[PDB]
Amino acid sequence: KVLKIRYPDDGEWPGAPIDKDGDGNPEFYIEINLWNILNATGFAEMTYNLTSGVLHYVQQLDNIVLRDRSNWVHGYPEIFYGNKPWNANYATDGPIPLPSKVSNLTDFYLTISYKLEPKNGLPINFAIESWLTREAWRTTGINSDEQAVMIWIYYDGLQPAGSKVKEIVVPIIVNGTPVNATFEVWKANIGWEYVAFRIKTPIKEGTVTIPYGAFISVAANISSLPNYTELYLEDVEIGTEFGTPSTTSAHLEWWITNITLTPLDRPLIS
Ligand SMILES: OC[C@H]1O[C@@H](O[C@H]2[C@H](O)[C@@H](O)[C@H](O)O[C@@H]2CO)[C@H](O)[C@@H](O)[C@@H]1O
Ligand SMILES: OC[C@H]1O[C@@H](O[C@H]2[C@H](O)[C@@H](O)[C@H](O)O[C@@H]2CO)[C@H](O)[C@@H](O)[C@@H]1O
Ligand SMILES: [Ca+2]
Ligand SMILES: [Ca+2]
Numbered sequence: 001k002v003l004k005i006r007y008p009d010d011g012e013w014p015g016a017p018i019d020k021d022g023d024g025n026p027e028f029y030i031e032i033n034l035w036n037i038l039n040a041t042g043f044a045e046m047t048y049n050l051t052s053g054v055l056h057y058v059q060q061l062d063n064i065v066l067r068d069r070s071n072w073v074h075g076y077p078e079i080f081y082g083n084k085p086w087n088a089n090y091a092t093d094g095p096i097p098l099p100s101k102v103s104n105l106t107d108f109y110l111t112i113s114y115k116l117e118p119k120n121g122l123p124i125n126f127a128i129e130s131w132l133t134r135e136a137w138r139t140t141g142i143n144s145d146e147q148a149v150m151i152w153i154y155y156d157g158l159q160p161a162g163s164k165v166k167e168i169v170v171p172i173i174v175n176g177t178p179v180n181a182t183f184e185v186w187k188a189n190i191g192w193e194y195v196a197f198r199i200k201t202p203i204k205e206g207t208v209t210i211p212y213g214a215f216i217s218v219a220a221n222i223s224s225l226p227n228y229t230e231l232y233l234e235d236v237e238i239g240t241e242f243g244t245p246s247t248t249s250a251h252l253e254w255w256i257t258n259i260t261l262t263p264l265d266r267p268l269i270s
Contacts, residue, residue: 043058098233127238129148145226181200
């Protein structure tokens with residue numbers, strides 16, 4: 001009834017599928033994904049109770065030495081739907097057919113119920129990420145003519161890569177109440193084009209619904225990439241980037257109780 005992955009016990013890259021019906025197609029995939037940590041004392045453990053429906057992440061790391069301080073953050077412990085293009089992990093048992101070309105996808109709501117508890121002022125975000133790639137099923141990384149989209153619905157102590165472009169309004173739902181929220185739009189080129197949407201009013205816990213097309217439409221419209229609508233939206237990743245090159249201790253706990261993607265009857269790009 002309980003799935004657990006644990007760093008460092010399970011190796012430097014713990015991860016596992018969530019496959020509640022045991023049919024060989026995961027509904028989601030979890031990774032501890034401490035992708036910029038070279039060494040640390042302590043541990044990180046992610047547990048999914050299949051029976052109670054709670055994803056619970058506990059991290060207690062110290063003596064942290066990074067792989068490349070120029071990458072700034074330490075990692076991105078996460079859960080995702082679709083094909084994560086950095087590795088051979090995937091989860092495609094869901095209602096939105098990912099990967100799909102941006103031009104063929106419908107819009108969808110993404111609803112997440114969560115609670116974040118960074119300890120001692122640890123810089124963090126709670127960020128939704130998609131990667132947009134030239135091939136349908138990428139498993140070997142990301143090229144300079146491709147895109148990362150991030151949507152930060154919480155942050156503390158981190159700013160997105162690159163420079164600020166503009167602010168936009170996106171209608172979202174927070175704790176059951178519709179609200180117009182403001183997002184700063186940031187753009188960088190860090191080996192690929194990077195577009196981040198940073199909410200101006202961070203939400204540290206609750207149930208949040210966002211319309212995914214509001215973000216991908218603006219990411220398409222400010223992009224410098226050619227033939228944007230031919231890219232494939234590979235996945236939707238949910239997790240917390242954390243840390244800075246000055247951070248040597250990172251204690252963090254969070255919980256996610258629901259992730260739902262709800263298809264809409266309108267195109268993803270408007
Ligand atoms: O590079 C940002 C990206 O890294 C991904 O991890 C890569 C890592 O960068 C590379 O050095 C290593 O060899 O491969 C892993 C993938 O297995 C990480 O998974 C992403 O979340 C992150 O955005
Ligand atoms: O390195 C990729 C990582 O960058 C993070 O932004 C850094 C930025 O790289 C640095 O130049 C700026 O001055 O500090 C910020 C952090 O506050 C970005 O937040 C991450 O999403 C991204 O993975
Ligand atoms: Ca399944
Ligand atoms: Ca993959």
